[PDB]
Amino acid sequence: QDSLSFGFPTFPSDQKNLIFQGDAQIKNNAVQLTKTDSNGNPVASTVGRILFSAQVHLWEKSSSRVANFQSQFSFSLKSPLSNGADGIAFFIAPPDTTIPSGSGGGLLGLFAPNQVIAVEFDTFYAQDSNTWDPNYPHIGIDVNSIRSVKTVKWDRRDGQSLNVLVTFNPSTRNLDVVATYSDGTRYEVSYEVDVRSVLPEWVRVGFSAASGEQYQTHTLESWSFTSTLLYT
Template structure:
């Protein structure tokens, strides 16, 4: 049944999946409160205060390099993490009523194998190993012996004490990976050796370091974790992949979690680059939360007058749903394309044809607009006959 569900999601078009993502994040938009995390990062330096770099991870050229790209340094046997400096409040049970956080993240990345082919155990001149977006217990650090296939998430000797949830972007076929699957994306639950719903990732252009836009969202009501990938260089937005898994994160992770990126190489190498990162989380907690993470200052006190009104959230959710459905008429189908246009403009590579295509694209006019423009269809506005 899970396999059939996964195949169904793979067949969905990107614009529909975007609507699904939007609908799943509506509860988040209607429940912003103190203590939640929201940020947009588009330029990274070694002095970026909100990012903590670990081991071989560093900032270079305004981006995050998880496994180093510095001249004079070997690219093999590298492991690094880049995490947000504050933990996320994943769930709260101080009122006796368990509440889970909604969260969504979007990031632009590239894996560059420097023209090396698909990573396979039978090939010495190939690439490896990949990286992951992950959540782990607050204070989590890179485990010993966790490079190569373990992506800096767990010790490769054993996964008995591993505790994490991750979305992996794997570029090497290990012994535990599906034998017919090459590069793939999957969801990991406490182990990289037993991935959930792996999806083959054939369009990635890793040989040339092609950019990819990734969207990950978790809905606390449905317990669904959804992943959508979009080729940032594809105007037709046909190159996309998606997968999902249903899980109660409170069963696998503690109340406070560290989150970010982790990547590694082994005897084979590649580059793992994060160009931008957006993140937003939302958790409604009790008026007097009893738990704060160690060494982290609590957020501003919540105003006692701000009492929850269920009917307001219901109205907001309904209104948000209607608004999201209206977006089907235009925004979702243009989402990946607009990101491409923006990058082309920023790089100065926008062609005249593309500009004209955007300007001269067909447009619908209402009857009122036509009536006003033609002065009630006056005869003096008619073009000549014959």
């Protein structure tokens, strides 16, 4: 399909178009990328992802067209542990992408010590962070192996939902990420990326989270996505 759109104002249990991976599953009409005990609280050493069944025709060489697309979602994070971890992330990878062996923890079930595009919302520590301020969370644009090729200071607000909007326009190869809270608190970051130089014409779009030594929930509450091939 040149064009594809789908939305989940909410995440009821009887899902069908979502490829749950890892501890991923539905509870309380939402998606827990990270595992969560019986009482709802997050556990440790948990990782999970979910993709949308239908693949998105990212781009097409035969017609020199790239997909102009938008991704709107919302996630709230919760955890007793004073400093939740590690983070959630919207990614775009090849269709057959599966959780990389040992990609848990600060890798967010995405990478392992690929070919991907991602907009991760980290909250873990890095005693060497070279593209952010470690002693403070961050939103990072991950292109291929290069993690956070551009970041923006963020804030982890326990239990509070964060409405985000990932929009990529091929007419500029401009990927914008606008995340905001309930009280107008606004966090953003843009970055020129040529989706073609890093992903196959056909990909899969979805989310990933993870927790290692420490934890937090990564409740995916709503989502919407649209992509359309544009000449050029």
